[PDB]
Amino acid sequence: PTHLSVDTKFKTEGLCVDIPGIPKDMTYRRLISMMGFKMNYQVNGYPNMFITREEAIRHVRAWIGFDVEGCHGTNLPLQLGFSTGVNLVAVPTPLMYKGLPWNVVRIKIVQMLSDTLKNLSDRVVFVLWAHGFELTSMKYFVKIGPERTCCLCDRRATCFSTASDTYACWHHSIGFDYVYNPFMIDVQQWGFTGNLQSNHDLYCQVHGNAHVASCDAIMTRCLAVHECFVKRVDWTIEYPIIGDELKINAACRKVQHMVVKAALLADKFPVLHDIGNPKAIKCVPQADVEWKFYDAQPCSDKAYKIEELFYSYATHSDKFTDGVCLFWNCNVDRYPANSIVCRFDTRVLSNLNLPGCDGGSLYVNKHAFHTPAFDKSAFVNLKQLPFFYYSDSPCESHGIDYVPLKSATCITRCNLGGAVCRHHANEYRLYLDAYNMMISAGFSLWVYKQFDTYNLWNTFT
């Protein structure tokens, strides 16, 4: 059970309005044959055009919703819609394009998928709510065959060119006209009652139905993400490194240690309530503070209600008002005023952050985390945490050329003494790099209103 057997049954009830008379008994093998594709008994890495739900989840970065609506089926123009917002009209002679023949439409498809996916995935997975026309239109822009490599690099081939008779990956496909060996999954096969809009609207109010193919393509991919990442969550699935994952995670651990350590030194809290990851470790192991941990896995649907995080049933909760609360990526509706908070901003544009369900986003870095929509009102009791670098380490070099550092936010004994030493300047610039990496990845930092770095200077006496 590695791939989806071509002899698996495909429910054809969703297909019978575009294709009336379709057999109720249908296998993937017969469907693929009906679509105009010949697998010809080939054991070359492409056993089926269609993939399992499990394989689709492993390749979420490759998901592109796809819908086809009949504008007028051999003699009529089709509107091709993609979860990128693109609508192309193909004539058989929110971005809406005018009627053009397939030979030019297919060039645009390859360009669009290539620009969208080159930094996300080695493939495309068309996410469908299959009614018939999307499957029968594939033959006009898709070619299949054995698994191949790019003509310019070692990556797998995702495109084919009839002009040059060559294959390319998403990075080297300029001028290519066919999508080569794509994958697809039909959301309707999962067992739903009612149409696409009725199932999508149950979970999401951000995607409306403006009655174009791209709206359906968006809704289809949204509903798929809800089913695979919101209601059902899998933290055993690892995802490849496609960008700054390692640097971002390392920056996150540096910022956390810095901010929490300085909050403990500035306001000397006697107790810290660490609410979040059940596998969390003390980010400041040498701190005096009474460290108390509370387990809450990342919320993937709605933000946790703060009232429910403290709901102790028939017994008393701990006194959250005593000391400080640390919410490191533990997303709540409204933070207590005595908090240190790291909250991922779902609106961030990046190769790690994919569009999600109901305003939320699917953040993919080692694991997939569907995150609830960033909401500014969650931080009404707090303020934005300013950048600062703090260090009590000795002014000792141990060792990359140099320019003297002048900064009001380098909180060290040397800067108090009038001149930042080389070590603390090197460490300040590295910390500032890590800090900017974390902010630009989408993370935002918030703190209790009494926080003041001026209180850190007297820790050097």
Find the helix packing angle between 245-267 and 422-440, rounded to 10°.
110
Task: Please identify which of the residues 67, 177, 186, 227 carries the catalytic annotation.
Answer: 67
Tell me whether residue 39 or residue 151 sits nearer to Zn ion (CB atom): 151
Per-residue contact track with ligand VZS, 287 to 316, x per CB under 6 A?
A: -------x--------------xxxx--x-
Joined together, the tokens standing for residue 181 give 């060996």
Is 67 marked within a binding site?
Answer: yes
Phi, psi for residue 443 in degrees, rounded to 5: -75, 145
**Cβ neighbours around 231 below 10 Å, total:** 12
CB of residue 270 to ligand VZS, shortest distance in Å: 13
| Sign of the torsion formed by the C-alpha atoms of 225, 230, 233 and 237 | positive
Tell me whether residue 338 or residue 361 sits nearer to ligand VZS (CB atom): 338
* Calpha distance 110→101 (Å, rounded): 15
Tell me whether residue 45 or residue 417 sits nearer to Zn ion (CB atom): 417
Joined together, the tokens standing for residue 2 give 């590695």
Per-residue contact track with ligand VZS, 226 to 265, x per CB under 6 A?
A: ----------------------------------------
452 given a catalytic annotation: no
CB–CB of 81/215 below 8 Å?
yes
How would you classify the pairing of strands 367-371 and 361-365?
antiparallel
* Calpha distance 234→237 (Å, rounded): 6
What residue spans of 194-339 are helical by DSSP H? 196-201, 213-225, 245-267, 306-309
55 given a catalytic annotation: no
In this chain, which of 34, 91, 107, 395 binds Zn ion, going by CB under 5 A? 395
Contacts of 153 (CB under 8 A, 6+ apart): 169, 171, 172
Q: Which does 275 bind (CB under 5 to 8 A by kind): Zn ion, ligand VZS, none?
A: ligand VZS
134 given a catalytic annotation: yes
**Cβ neighbours around 266 below 10 Å, total:** 19
| DSSP string across 365-419 | ESEEEEEPPP-GGGGTTEEEPPP-EE--S-S------------TTEESHHHHTTS
216 given a catalytic annotation: yes
CB of residue 317 to ligand VZS, shortest distance in Å: 4
Tell me whether residue 209 or residue 317 sits nearer to ligand VZS (CB atom): 317
Tell me whether residue 157 or residue 275 sits nearer to ligand VZS (CB atom): 275
Is 279 marked within a binding site?
Answer: yes
Task: Please identify which of the residues 18, 177, 186, 216 carries the catalytic annotation.
Answer: 216
Joined together, the tokens standing for residue 209 give 């139905």
Is 277 marked within a binding site?
Answer: yes
Is 174 marked within a binding site?
Answer: no
CB of residue 305 to ligand VZS, shortest distance in Å: 11
* Calpha distance 404→385 (Å, rounded): 26
Q: Which 226-265 positions form the footprint of Zn ion (CB under 5 A)?
A: none
Task: Please identify which of the residues 211, 316, 396, 401 carries the catalytic annotation.
Answer: 211
Task: Please identify which of the residues 18, 134, 177, 227 carries the catalytic annotation.
Answer: 134
396 given a catalytic annotation: no
CB of residue 232 to ligand VZS, shortest distance in Å: 23
> What's the gap between Cα 403 and its chain centre?
39
Q: Which does 312 bind (CB under 5 to 8 A by kind): ligand VZS, Zn ion, none?
A: ligand VZS
Tell me whether residue 330 or residue 410 sits nearer to ligand VZS (CB atom): 330
Q: Which does 456 bind (CB under 5 to 8 A by kind): ligand VZS, Zn ion, none?
A: none
Joined together, the tokens standing for residue 317 give 């909760």
Dihedral angle computed from the Cα positions of residues 188, 194, 199 and 200, in that order, rounded to the nearest 10 degrees: 80
CB of residue 221 to Zn ion, shortest distance in Å: 8
Q: Which does 297 bind (CB under 5 to 8 A by kind): Zn ion, ligand VZS, none?
A: none
Write the CA distances from 220 to 84, 291, 384, integer angstroms: 12, 45, 37
Question: Which region among 80-88, 317-325, 376-384, 388-396 touches ligand VZS (by CB under 6 A)?
Answer: 317-325
357 in contact with ligand VZS (CB under 6 A):
no
Tell me whether residue 68 or residue 411 sits nearer to Zn ion (CB atom): 411
Q: Which 402-431 positions form the footprint of Zn ion (CB under 5 A)?
A: 412, 414, 421, 424
CB–CB of 302/372 below 8 Å?
yes
| Sign of the torsion formed by the C-alpha atoms of 173, 179, 223 and 60 | negative
Task: Please identify which of the residues 18, 59, 69, 186 carries the catalytic annotation.
Answer: 69
How would you classify the pairing of strands 382-384 and 443-448?
antiparallel
CB–CB of 7/28 below 8 Å?
yes
Tell me whether residue 353 or residue 412 sits nearer to Zn ion (CB atom): 412
List interacting residues with Zn ion (CB under 5 A).
150, 152-153, 155, 169, 171-172, 204, 207, 222, 395, 412, 414, 421, 424
Active site residues: 67, 69, 134, 211, 216
Q: Which residues contribute to the annotated binding site for Zn(2+)?
A: 150, 153, 169, 172, 200, 204, 207, 222, 395, 414, 421, 424
Q: Which residues contribute to the annotated binding site for S-adenosyl-L-methionine?
A: 274-280
List interacting residues with ligand VZS (CB under 6 A).
273, 275, 294, 309-312, 315, 317-318, 320
